[PDB]
Design a protein around this nucleic acid. Structure first.
Length: 50
RNA sequence: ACGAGAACGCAGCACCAGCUGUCCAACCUGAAGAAGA
């Protein structure tokens, strides 16, 4: 990884953001108080790795 | 009633002229703002 060379992401539209709540899997889907800002699905992101 | 008396070893003269404290050298290497149930 000392020779792996990854870059930062490119321009991302502000419209592609959303707020989601954590969901569980233990015997049910229990809502959680933690809400976080997330990019919506189906969003293109550009990188550059060498 | 002295081989003695008198007599500045003194006068003018820049330790001064030329000369980069310079040349070469990444503040660099590795690291998920992330996870219970």
């Amino acid at each position: 990884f000392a020779h792996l060379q990854v870059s930062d992401s490119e321009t991302i539209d502000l419209e592609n953001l959303k707020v989601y709540q954590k969901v569980d899997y233990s015997k049910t889907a229990k809502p959680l108080p933690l809400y976080r800002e997330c990019l919506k699905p189906n969003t293109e992101i550009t990188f550059t790795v060498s």
